[PDB]
Design a protein around this nucleic acid. Structure first.
Ligand SMILES: [Zn+2]
Ligand SMILES: [Zn+2]
Ligand SMILES: [Zn+2]
Lengths: 231, 332, 77, 105, 99, 81, 237, 161
RNA sequence: CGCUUCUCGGCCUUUUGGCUAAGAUCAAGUGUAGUAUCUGUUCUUAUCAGUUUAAUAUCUGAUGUCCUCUCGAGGAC
């Protein structure tokens, strides 16, 4: 009867979102806690880390991941500079039918840190293939995107015209993104760029009949030293 | 960025102070514990100036500290109860000018924990046993005996655990070469935990309870417990055995109470108040620190009250039973 | 001990690498850890003996038969 | 130890009597069950050093031959403050191996 | 006894190696002997072992023979095309359903 | 069943050995009160937080210590049932 | 040899001859151990590789090991993981140099399907964090803790106990403020399998460092009939 | 507000498509429906944007984007109807050409401006192959004799090559 | 232009030197604890109520009133 008494007084997910100051934080299962109020308040504190997603999944963790084939682990490039890949291949192949200064320099002289996630980055099944999104930034580009466009990749990409910069200057930039500035369209042509119609031109500056730009500015019209640094 | 940290002038506030003949000779010196610095002063007798004989750093919070001295020994050691897990016994070598660590015994994890001892430290006057107590649930006792070469030796810990019991102050009781007794104010919150109404928070008064070592059987038994009228905050040992009666003075809010076990009845006084003060009348008054002076002839205590008035307390006794307590103003 | 044991395990492994090729077995894969996987059933198999015994199963056979009928229906001066 | 979870320790108040290990078991930490970097000494409960047991291998139960130490880890995480680590259950392993012995030869 | 895994390894090993080197074969699986491999193959595994129930005519022949040549099963079993084990137990079964 | 009651014995004993641990049915009240009581013992410990309060209010360290130890009895109101 | 003193001495001699000659020859032969009879051991060979790498500084061997991690055979991948574990336990303070190198390996183990790789990878992190105590390499320990954490729901005693060990190592190396932030949201979850796991972790913390935890608890709002906020902590001066 | 993406080059990732649509608008649903057998692109995809004007803007701005070099057809989700044009301006390109000329119908082929080989300027002509005779007819009906950018436009059905 | 035969170029198949006594020959450590994977085998019941669970589940139990036909059915309610 006591279990039923708590059930009878148990809150709906709508009520729990209502009284609670933050409602998103509130999951469908939080309504099943002993104290809905303390649990939502504890999930609504800064810097906390949410419980891993697979607690309820009937199947196992990485057992569910299973079936596809995976390429063997790829060595850190600075270990790869030693070539111990080649030495191991040669000895292994002879059987199948290295100097020391390079190794010490590889560990100390030229070893550098990797890219590491900050506190709150939980691992989950698919995070290695999760598509990085949200990047609403027009300025960021790729090399696969540039090449598969036929647009230059690397340091010349800025003078390599994105084929929709001419449509930015023609209909305005993408209308969902007024905040989009396009170099050579709403900011000046990048350094050493040239507006033009030849292969590699920046079009013509978006212009009104008095001589002001209709989009951005097509021509481009403290003491940050750290405190205690080594020498 | 990589940083290196030095000091420029060491801490200079004082949180405990004990006085002994720490260097072996009739001249008597002070040890003061700053926060995490421990340093020994000595006041020169004629001119009265005070000299900092030595100041060492201990990298650890010192929570309590006591002086103590074996029977007929002419030095005085230093028991120090830190926030570490260990009790340690130090001794000041006047020659080389440094504290030597005579002993260090471990009994728990480190840091100002709740149930791991170290806060309260008490010793029994004739030098036989030291007890170290937490704020809850744990008390230990060590016995200290001189060896063949009369160097110091420390026993294995005894044990007095008792669940759900805060401890406001612990102090050794003076008895002549009998079982040592320690007399620790207490309080027992266990039932107040389960009073959904809120009663047992009130009507739960604190109980003074004489523990007692038992040299014969080598353990520690709670001998006498007894409720106190109202909450008191610390105890003053009363030099017992030959000089003076035995027993303890309690210095509770607004009163001071001699109270000893046996048949001795309880004796009270209210604390004399400032003629026409300006204080908010509701605020009580308590005793903050205290200091016994004991001479071959007599003894008297000084005790100091919240506003800063000293009082010279003396005990008028009938040969074994104390009859009246007599306070008079001293200074401020 | 190890030389004959290593030869024994190697010979077994080469043995149904040859047999898998002779039965033109599609749903066969060796993973990067050297264990045997059925791509049709998403099942891991330790030994080559375990893998061949898995191919004769209500699990393998029913998956093979279901994969079968679905494929046939699924094609088009 | 970390290897047979069916084993128990004395877990009373430590004392002043040092702990010793058999020649058989010697060279290891008692808890982290490694074999390296001995830092600090073991101390054992008064009972667990009473009686004939003066000088016994804490683990193997046999003759004391050397001192028993604590690995750097266990002393860094302060697992060395739990009193007597004296194991007050003999464990199935010694029993069963002796029994199979008496059977065989 | 034999487990299906050892069984499959046997099938493959035989079809590769031919019926004549049982030493190599038995070397393959652990806790299996060359004599046992040979026996099992000829007894159960080999495809020529016909695995069905007895016809009425087959049981007529069996009964008649085991009456003709008492207890000689390795002599009979070729004549009706089953193993000594099949002939033996199955004759036991007929005898028990009769009595 | 067996899991629940052996882990229940282990949690009740580990708790009666260490005041303040928890177990899968610890309620908001006991959590919060053990957490106060530890804060209190630690203010009286660290010689300094005492100075901080004894200057923030205008009381003297003996009176401050006394009020802390008064409160350690029932710091977060009376229990909940 | 079914005795242990024998195997012990064996390993120590392998160290000695490594010193006699040079790491590479002995390391190559030691690595050629796939030695099926797994425990009773190739494990002792793992210890031997550790002593090798230790006695002649691990500049030399760590590339060889990280290389072997590619050979697709199971027991040898796990061999390299163990050998790493012992390596860090043995050399201790010097890991402050190789932790940056090693991590992306351990990442790779902690994110894969089977329990043996996760249990052995978790041992490594334990020892590594205990060795790097106090040297400022915390960002990478924090990242390794993020991969370790999700196994916390698991069943096989060897992996659950390896994981718990790893977590208390990381406690001393990251601080308890971190472990507490990881441990909060599930102290009061509606489940009970999780609440079991989380209160087990949170005890294992609170027993150690129950003093440090004072300045770390979150601020919890008081309701009508109680008072849950500590005000003495924001007496402002 | 869903977009038909046809002619998408087999190697183009739906990730890359949503990547280009990231600068383009509220990328809400990128889905490259594919043959579940061969795995590679099915030459069709649906990309629904949250805003209709942003969807149409991506259709009108992403026109003929050379996917792996090949212009992919992004819009809402050769019958001999080609117009040729005389008097074409030399500063006009196929971009603005198709951008304006799309009015009478969808363009089936890339508008070829008649340009000479040496310097590369237009010879004064253009053409584009629409979808239907009605589309070429409405184009040549609104665009014949009228003023193109700086040269009066001339539109008539293209002479078959 | 039709037929037929031959020459060549482009090439989509197998391809160890034999005899001898099948030349001869033919290895598995043990124990204690725990996990994983295969092979195997099985749930269509309708409510309600209960137990239990985070939620199912499970498991527990029983199949509006009267007459009659053969759980169904008709009617007066
Ligand atoms: Zn250890
Ligand atoms: Zn003991
Ligand atoms: Zn032993």
């Amino acid at each position: 009867s006591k279990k039923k008494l708590r059930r009878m007084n148990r809150f709906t997910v709508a009520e729990l979102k209502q009284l609670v100051a933050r409602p998103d934080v509130v999951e469908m299962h939080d309504v099943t806690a002993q104290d809905p109020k303390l649990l939502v308040h504890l999930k609504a504190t800064r810097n906390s880390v949410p419980v891993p997603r697979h607690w309820c999944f009937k199947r196992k963790y990485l057992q569910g991941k299973r079936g596809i084939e995976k390429p063997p682990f790829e060595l850190p490039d600075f270990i790869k500079r030693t070539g111990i890949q080649e030495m191991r291949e040669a000895l292994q192949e002879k059987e199948e039918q290295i100097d020391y200064q390079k190794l010490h320099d590889a560990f100390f002289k030229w070893q550098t840190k990797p890219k590491l996630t900050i506190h709150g980055d939980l691992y989950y099944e698919g995070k290695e293939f999760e598509t990085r999104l949200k990047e609403k930034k027009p300025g960021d580009l790729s090399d696969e995107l540039r090449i598969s466009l036929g647009m230059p990749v690397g340091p010349n990409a800025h003078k390599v015209p994105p084929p929709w910069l001419i449509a930015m200057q023609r209909y305005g930039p993408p209308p969902s993104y007024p905040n989009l500035k396009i170099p050579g369209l709403n900011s000046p042509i990048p350094e050493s760029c040239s507006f033009g119609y030849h292969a590699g031109g920046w079009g013509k500056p978006p212009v009104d009949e008095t001589g002001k730009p209709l989009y951005g500015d097509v021509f481009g019209t403290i003491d940050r030293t750290p405190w205690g640094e080594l020498e | 960025m990589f940083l290196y940290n030095l000091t420029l002038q060491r801490a200079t506030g004082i949180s405990f102070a004990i006085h002994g003949n720490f260097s072996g000779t009739k001249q008597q010196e002070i040890v003061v514990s700053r926060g995490k610095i421990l340093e020994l002063l000595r006041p020169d007798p004629n001119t009265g100036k005070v000299h900092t004989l030595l100041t060492v750093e201990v990298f650890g919070v010192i929570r309590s500290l006591m002086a103590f001295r074996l029977t007929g020994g002419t030095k005085d050691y230093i028991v120090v109860g830190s926030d570490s897990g260990r009790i340690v016994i130090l001794e000041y070598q006047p020659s080389k000018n440094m504290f030597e660590k005579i002993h260090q015994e471990t009994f728990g994890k480190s840091g100002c924990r709740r149930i791991v001892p170290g806060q309260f430290l008490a010793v029994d006057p004739k030098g036989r046993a030291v007890m170290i107590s937490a704020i809850e649930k744990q008390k230990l006792v060590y016995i200290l005996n001189r060896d063949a070469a009369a160097r110091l030796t420390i026993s294995s810990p005894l044990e007095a655990h008792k669940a759900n019991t805060l401890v406001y102050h612990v102090v050794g009781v003076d008895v002549g070469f009998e079982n040592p007794m320690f007399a620790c104010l207490e309080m027992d919150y266990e039932e107040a935990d389960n009073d959904p109404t809120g009663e047992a928070a009130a009507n739960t008064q604190q109980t003074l309870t004489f523990y007692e070592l038992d040299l014969g059987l080598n353990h520690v038994v709670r001998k006498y417990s007894e409720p106190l009228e109202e909450h008191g905050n610390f105890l003053i040992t009363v030099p017992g055995g030959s000089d003076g009666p035995s027993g303890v003075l309690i210095c509770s809010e607004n009163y001071i109470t001699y109270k000893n076990f046996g048949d001795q009845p309880d004796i009270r006084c209210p604390i004399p108040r400032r003629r026409n003060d300006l204080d908010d009348p509701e605020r009580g008054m308590i005793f903050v620190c205290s200091a016994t002076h004991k001479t071959k002839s007599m003894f008297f205590f000084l005790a100091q009250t919240e506003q800063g008035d000293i009082f010279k307390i003396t005990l008028e006794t009938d040969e074994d039973m104390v009859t009246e307590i007599r306070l008079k103003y001293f200074d401020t | 001990s190890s030389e004959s044991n290593r030869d024994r395990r190697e010979r077994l492994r080469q043995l149904a690498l040859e047999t898998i090729d002779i039965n033109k077995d599609p749903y066969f894969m060796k993973n990067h850890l050297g264990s045997y996987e059925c791509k049709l059933c998403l099942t891991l198999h330790n030994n080559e003996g375990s893998y061949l015994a898995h191919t004769q199963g209500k699990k393998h056979q029913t998956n093979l038969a279901r994969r079968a009928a679905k494929e046939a229906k699924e094609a088009p001066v | 130890a970390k290897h047979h979870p069916d084993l128990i320790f004395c877990r009373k108040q430590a004392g002043v009597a040092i702990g010793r290990l058999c020649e058989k078991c010697d060279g290891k930490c008692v808890i982290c069950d490694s074999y390296v970097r001995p830092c600090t000494l073991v101390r054992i409960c008064d009972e667990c050093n009473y009686g004939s047991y003066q000088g016994r291998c804490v683990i193997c139960g046999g003759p004391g031959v050397s001192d028993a130490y604590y690995c750097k880890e266990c002393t860094i995480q302060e697992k060395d403050r739990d009193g007597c680590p004296k194991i007050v259950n003999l464990g199935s392993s010694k029993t069963d191996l002796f029994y199979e012995r008496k059977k065989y030869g | 006894v034999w487990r299906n895994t050892e069984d499959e390894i046997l099938k493959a090993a035989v079809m590769k190696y031919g019926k004549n080197q049982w030493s190599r074969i038995a070397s393959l699986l652990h806790r299996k002997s060359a004599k046992q491999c040979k026996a099992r193959w000829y007894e159960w595994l080999d495809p020529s072992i016909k695995k069905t129930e007895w016809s009425r005519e087959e049981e007529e022949k069996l009964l008649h023979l085991a009456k003709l040549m008492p207890t000689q099963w390795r002599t009979i079993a070729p004549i009706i095309g089953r193993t000594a084990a099949q002939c033996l137990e199955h004759y036991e079964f007929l005898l028990d359903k009769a009595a | 069943m067996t899991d629940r009651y052996t882990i229940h014995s282990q949690l009740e004993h580990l708790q009666s050995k260490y005041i303040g641990t928890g177990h899968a049915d610890t309620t908001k009240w006991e959590w919060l009160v053990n957490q106060h009581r530890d804060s209190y013992c630690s203010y009286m410990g660290h010689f300094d937080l005492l100075n901080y309060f004894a200057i923030a209010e205008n009381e003297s360290k003996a009176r401050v210590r006394f009020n802390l130890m008064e409160k350690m009895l029932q710091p977060c109101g009376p229990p909940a049932d | 040899a079914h005795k242990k003193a024998i195997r012990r001495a064996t390993v120590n001699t392998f160290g000695y001859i490594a010193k006699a000659i040079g790491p590479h020859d002995v390391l190559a032969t030691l690595l050629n151990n796939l030695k099926v009879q797994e425990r009773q051991n190739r494990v002792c060979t793992t210890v031997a590789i550790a002593i090798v790498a230790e006695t002649c500084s691990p500049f030399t061997v760590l590339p060889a090991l990280m290389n072997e991690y590619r050979v697709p055979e199971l027991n040898v991948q796990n061999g390299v993981l163990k050998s790493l574990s012992f390596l860090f336990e043995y050399i201790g303070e010097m890991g402050k140099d190789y932790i940056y190198a090693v991590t992306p390996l351990l990442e790779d183990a902690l994110m894969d399907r089977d329990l043996v790789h996760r249990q052995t990878a978790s041992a490594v992190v334990q020892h590594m964090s205990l060795g790097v105590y106090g040297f400022g390499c915390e960002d990478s320990l924090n990242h390794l803790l993020n991969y370790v954490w999700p196994n916390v729901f698991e069943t096989s005693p060897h992996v659950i106990q390896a994981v718990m060990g790893a977590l208390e190592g990381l406690r001393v190396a990251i601080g308890p403020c971190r472990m507490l932030q990881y441990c909060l949201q599930g102290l009061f979850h509606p489940a009970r399998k999780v609440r079991d796991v989380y209160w087990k972790i949170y005890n294992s913390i609170y027993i150690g460092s129950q003093d440090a935890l004072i300045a770390h608890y979150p601020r919890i709002y008081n309701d009508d009939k109680n008072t849950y906020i500590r005000y003495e902590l924001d007496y402002i001066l | 507000a869903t977009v038909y993406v046809g002619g998408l080059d087999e190697k183009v990732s739906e990730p890359l498509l949503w990547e280009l649509f990231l600068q383009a608008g509220p990328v809400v649903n990128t889905h490259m429906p594919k043959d579940r057998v061969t795995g590679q692109h099915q030459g069709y995809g649906f990309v629904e944007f949250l805003s209709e004007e942003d969807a149409d803007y991506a259709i009108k701005i992403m026109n003929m984007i050379k996917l792996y070099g090949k212009p992919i057809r992004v819009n809402k989700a050769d019958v001999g109807a080609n117009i040729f044009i005389g008097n074409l301006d030399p500063e006009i390109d196929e971009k603005l050409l198709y951008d304006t000329f799309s009015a009478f119908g969808v363009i089936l082929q890339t508008p070829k401006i008649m340009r000479d080989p040496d310097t590369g300027n237009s010879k004064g002509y253009a053409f584009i192959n629409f979808a239907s005779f009605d589309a070429s007819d409405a184009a040549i009906e609104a665009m014949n004799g009228q003023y193109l950018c700086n040269r009066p436009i001339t539109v008539s059905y293209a002479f078959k090559k």
